[model samples]
Target: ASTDYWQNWTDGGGIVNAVNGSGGNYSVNWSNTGNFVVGKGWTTGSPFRTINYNAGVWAPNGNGYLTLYGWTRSPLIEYYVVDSWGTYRPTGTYKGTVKSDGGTYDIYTTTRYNAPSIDGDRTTFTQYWSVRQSKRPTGSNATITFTNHVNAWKSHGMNLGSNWAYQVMATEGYQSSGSSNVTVW
Candidate 1:
């Protein structure tokens, strides 16, 4: 079996954001340019794609590496704040409590694949909280998990459902079999 790993960083945003380039713990920008519509799934030139504020252009790296932009997202857990409509707010945190689906959940920031989807007919991918987490004991073997909560919207073409349920997208995996030790150092 193969294992996935997410980096160690602070957490923020309504959902998880990839923790690359930006150190970590930066509030996830849900705007068009921010964490909302950037990365694996959507990019410039792709169908229904939006222009990014930082890169300003869209083009795959050619080496077949998805430009991930180094970030990860998490599930929707509600916070204590309310909105103009008196609706509860959902947020992702590093170490605390979060509300979701009408109940509160303990917030644990670990690396795991959230929602993974293909962009514009399988060209690129739109990975929703696709992060990696390592086990404790320093060099201990690790296991990675992937969730498909956001796939319904991004890839499954099920945006017609409820707001949160429509956020479903896709999922994926990578592996290096027969390895002695998976080391990042």
Candidate 2:
């Protein structure tokens, strides 16, 4: 397997503002100069049987969004806190509700093609929490807690299988020509 990981992006002069980390914690400062920027704080670990996290972001300029995201193969569940502006697979079926430290999110499940993979394109189930634009701000410091997505999904009568996979803390900027910072542990 591949253990290589990084916090990176494309388009919009995504420049690194700062970076700090030690042990199992990390922080990255990002400067996005418009168009689009995709930044992630990531690491390699054993597949997750259950997952939880507490993270924060400070966007003094305010013009983008952040998402707490993850990916797994096997039964393939692309788990993430969906940003308000990013495109997502159409919600196939409304599953249930998940309560995070931030707020309540509507849970939905969908199957979509896993593209650009050497393993070949295959269908996968994606479970995600959808947040409203009003709840996600790009101008202020915000804390997000992904309390217990696995258990929450199980409550909705959908088992996303065991084997937690890769985890990531991601930020997306759309015309956010300013500075932003993110920390995860």
Candidate 3:
């Protein structure tokens, strides 16, 4: 007598003290639920570890599952974009014309679609992908900074919404007065 069923649960934020065991038995905590970070892991007879996931930090448990927390669930693509330069430009990777007179500088950015380390362990606990920012040139000679929606999803001609992804470009630059540009392949 085997059955296949799929159940989905979306709890905005909460904690689970106890779970049902064999014979319909359960062990519970008196006061520990709905906490941003909750649940501990046990290894046969070992202490439990707290589960927490930073906005852009994922840790591997070495097990099949990961502890995912600290993420804001939204519909838009979430990633980190860095602009080395603080000013604007007339033309850049984006579709719209980059503004000028605002220093007209451009920035290069990198977006990590998936964490190669974590792989695919999305059971038991939650899994998160860390979105980081880095200067294009790596060292000096880079300016501009990104805000809010860090990485360039559609603006850079990459469609994250459609699942089409891309990697960071090696080169990026700016203009002295007129305009600047940056592209990722």
Candidate 4:
């Protein structure tokens, strides 16, 4: 973990942002605002190994989701691995479900045309989503076997490009309030 990260699209800012501890453990929170994001993870991401997570406490304001979110540069693709969510579950042009880490996840794909992304403000990109069918409750320990999802997406013709960026244990809120205490290894 490098820095406590938080950013908002709207003019108003939110509550306390992310806080990083030693040895990959971090606490993050976002509240009282508009479209904003808070997370704790790596600046540079990889898909080579499994990501293990332990959430001492996870709370979302029934709007956004808890995900492993990031982007890739070669093709400028955004991706999400939604392990749990609030009242509103995310959806897309459904690409069927994938089995991994002893659970089932619904895979989806969508395109963002001239949307804001890591690359640029007006960049078009593909968003690959893998939403867990059986969501992990707010506070739970889990293993995210990265290869299983990678292979599953490959089978569905959703291939990611070379560069990986900002692979974080992320919590995104759309005009909502939430907080999390997580430790990753």
Candidate 5:
């Protein structure tokens, strides 16, 4: 059997040449100006594990990142704990940094107006970003203490909703080309 959550989505964009999914694992290699995300993970509850994820960011023409991505409802939200990225790193309101799983993550809060969210096609919501200060070494797993991030985000008023949804360790891209592979334990 596979993970409880595995998703491949790109509402519209460039081409996704190939994508493969297995029990608790996913792999994708894509190119273009469209956003593509393919991944697998456990339910969006506590004590989650995102161990042993992998990705590579070659000469990406746009933006690409490997992340632990998920959603929550009540007010509906999208979040990302980014471990790796290509050229254009994200920028938003500075929410400080959180130390977890060895290194520290710089937190940011941003807003999207009439954007695509898990709950609906056009919705308004906030994006919570936990981006590592320095890129993690590739070909290695990242063990996160979810509580560390949870508390950090909430402290800065980045509180998440109560209800949970599917959370995946994802390979995400925006207008770029790259390869990503993820394994959930």
Candidate 6:
């Protein structure tokens, strides 16, 4: 199951919630955007009791910054990239760091209320990669790779279980204004 209502608001153009198998891709053109998130949604058994493989690519026009993120029923919201103007920090506990061909990233884990709601709680872990300063991809045809979150979570002793539900790859535009485009695969 998928929907484009995730991109209903904000300032941008292109495809939203485009899915192909285990991948959810996005293509967007933005102009002075506020915040918009688009990705694929999987159905796991329970919240934190499901395990699934999640991955994707984010290609964006360097005009502004966006966030490449994922969430689970555990209500864990992990951010792959929080490319805002100057606010670049990974939330949760600092679980050390890792280096990639692009650059280095700080890992974190935290327990917070589930998103789109606050009824209960959830845990999230993420690696914040800076696109602007880390020689990362940017612009109309630049691609950014998001590290797999499942393995990272496992390293932190958080088992996502064996019941796979849903996983999505989306871009949350925060102050993402101007003429820009993003494509995920």
Candidate 5: tens digits of C-alpha lDDT, residues 1-185: 24686678885777765455556666777777477777777666553443445453323446887777888888688888887678977768888999988888899988999988887679889899999988777666557667788889988888888898887777788888766666665
Candidate with the larger TM-score of 2 and 3: 2
Question: Candidate 1's C-alpha lDDT?
Answer: 0.21
Where does candidate 2 clash, by residue pair? Answer: 47-164, 48-164, 62-138
Q: What would the per-residue lDDT of candidate 1 be over residues 1-185, giving only the tens digit for each residue?
A: 11122222212223323322231111121211111322222111111222111222112111111112222223322111111010111223334433322323333222224433221122222222222121112123221111222232234332211212111111111211011111211
Query: How high is the CA lDDT of each candidate model?
Result: 0.21, 0.49, 0.22, 0.74, 0.74, 0.39
TM-scores, all candidates, are 0.16, 0.56, 0.18, 0.86, 0.89, 0.48
Off-target runs (Cα >4 Å) in candidate 1 are 2-117, 120-127, 130-138, 145-185
TM-score of 4: 0.86
lDDT of 2 by residue, 1-185 (tens): 22134444444365544344443334445555543434344454333322233344444354555566665556566665653433332245777766655666667776555432213344445555545333454443344544455567667775653555556665555544444454444
Off by over 4 Å in 6: 1-35, 39-67, 74-87, 114-135, 139-149, 161-168, 175-179
Which residue pairs come into collision in candidate 4? none
lDDT of candidate 5 at residue 26, scale 0 to 100: 62
Stretches of candidate 3 above 4 Å error? Answer: 1-78, 83-155, 162-185
Best by TM-score: 5
TM-score computed on alpha carbons, candidate 5: 0.89
Better model by TM-score: candidate 1 vs candidate 6? 6
**Candidate 5 error regions (>4 Å):** 47-61
lDDT string for model 3 (1-185, tens) is: 11111111212223223333232122222122121122221211101112111111111111111111121122123222223221321122332223221222232223334322112333222221222222123222222232212243335443333331212211111211111121110
* Full-model lDDT, candidate 4: 0.74
Better of 4 and 5 by TM-score: 5
Worst 10 residues of 2 by lDDT: 45-54
